[PDB]
Design a protein around this nucleic acid. Sequence first.
DNA 1: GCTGATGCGTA
DNA 2: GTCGGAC
DNA 3: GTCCGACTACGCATCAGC
Length: 643
Amino acid sequence: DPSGYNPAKNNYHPVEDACWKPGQKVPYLAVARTFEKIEEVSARLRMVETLSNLLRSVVALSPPDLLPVLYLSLNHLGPPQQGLALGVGDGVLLKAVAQATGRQLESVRAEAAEKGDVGLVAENSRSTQRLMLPPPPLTASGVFSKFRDIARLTGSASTAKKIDIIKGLFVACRHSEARFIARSLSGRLRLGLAEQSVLAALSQAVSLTPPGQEFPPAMVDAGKGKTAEARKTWLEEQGMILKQTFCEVPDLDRIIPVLLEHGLERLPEHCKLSPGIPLKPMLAHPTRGISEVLKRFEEAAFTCEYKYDGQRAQIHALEGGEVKIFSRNQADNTGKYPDIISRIPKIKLPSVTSFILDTEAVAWDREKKQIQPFQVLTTRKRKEVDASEIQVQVCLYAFDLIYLNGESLVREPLSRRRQLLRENFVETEGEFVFATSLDTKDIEQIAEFLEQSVKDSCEGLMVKTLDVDATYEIAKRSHNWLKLKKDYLDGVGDTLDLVVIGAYLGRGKRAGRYGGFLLASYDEDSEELQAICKLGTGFSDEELEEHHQSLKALVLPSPRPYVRIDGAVIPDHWLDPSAVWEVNCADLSLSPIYPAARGLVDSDKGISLRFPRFIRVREDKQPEQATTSAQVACLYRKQSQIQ
DNA sequence: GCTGATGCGTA
DNA sequence: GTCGGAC
DNA sequence: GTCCGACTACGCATCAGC
Ligand SMILES: *P(=O)(O)OC[C@H]1O[C@@H](n2cnc3c(N)ncnc32)[C@H](O)[C@@H]1O
């Protein structure tokens, strides 16, 4: 009985402790009970083993259901390069809950905001749907198929057809299924277990219970013959095999069939990096100063590069001439850049047959020959576009080469990857140039280079080692680069003091308290408080709780007449304007919804804050002494990318 | 035909 | 994108 | 440091309502 399924017990037997016979469709309640055990605990090692116990039963009993269970665990619809999206958020989901329960739409919405979780609302609610015959139980493969049916619905009356499928899943839900069905559609499973733990559990499962055995499986625990140390070392080595293969081929549709046929030890023989298949990109960790760079990169030689304010473009050139461009989320952006594809012959030497370039697509003004801000880049059409209709030109800033002429450069150091990039590729001003770099260890040269990058319309500096731990192996370390921005440096930057005028009820980890706040600057001329941005990060859990304690005494039934928010989200609790906080941000943007400093730089648009975070409470200041809207306008114009 | 709410994907 | 929490 | 899930602004694409 899947209701009593306990994949977190001691001495879990993949065959006998399961809740379905061999060859049967894996019941979705087995996935739901697994999700229950995972969210109860907080140690990743316990979560991985609990999920591994489920996958071992799937491997031993119903191998065809391995893929949908893995996707349901990740809450994904398929490979990222296929661009499958549900099209369902909280708006559609809360409507499907109301129709399924006969409740008012706002009653469900208010309860969802109060409880901070939509899945809890769908669970305690009472179904108003009557069925002539009791529905069959949900299966993991059937539920996963319905999700892809919802994602496949487009056109007129799509919402009603999506809602019907969601309501069809709810009438067949048993026990905790409705809770996790709603969370999946809401996109907030709240497991504490994501892509890294799903892979860790997959490699542990296929290692302890090897696939491809005749039933019943002869080897059910391949680690019982090993010591605790030998078992740990072996499982860790098996985990790296899967992690590095998935880092180069993040496609479960390609790995899982190979895995069930040739095992994990022979997986690299059948799944290899190749152009046309997106790869996991290299990420960066923040650095709070030039001194910390030399500390993290002690002894090792590194290079400083401009950090361009654009969108990452992973450009693949296949053997044959086909070109594909992927985002850093492995989304296919080929149709977005007809101009880049036209430019490919201009960037490579005639000996270059195939490559994978790591570049930054930046909006480029061809009349003035200068970089344009990130907001200009986002105005480009996203769907299939034609090159003749392009209005915002892009310039590619290449900084790495991952693949060259049938050979992978993943395990080559950056010094060689960079050398191969600049030997085989041709620069063109305003179209394809190599990222501005500086090889140095001097603190004053790095400081001057950081100031020069901001003056040259860039966010700051990227710092990468050249020879020591300088490979492109994401499984070794996904954040092996360093980023140095001015807003990271203590004292070297501008911060704003804004008034808290509203609060937003928190979700998930913030459930039961405030998850966000609405901030405002003081407009001197109109003597009003103008909403500038929302704030929801920068404070500790202890600080957030004290914010929730004191601000509850400031809850107003209706807003004060001198508070202007315009198009901003109406706060859940209006707050009497009293608390003033210091806020840090990366940039100031021209906002389509916030009224702060409207008319001071633009007649229609106001100003907002890019990447805002809470620093400290300013008990010394009252709302009259907050940062003025005129000062907000001054800070916006002092930016290099702005007139 | 237009607009606004919703969803998604970039940072 | 930033951030803190649990490990 | 790793992994994870809270949270930010904003613009295109989509679709329901007018
Ligand atoms: P995130 O804040 O993790 O930073 C990494 C992204 O920065 C962009 N980027 C701009 N310029 C560079 C250079 N020179 N090297 C590497 N990355 C750069 C990329 O789009 C990254 O996604």
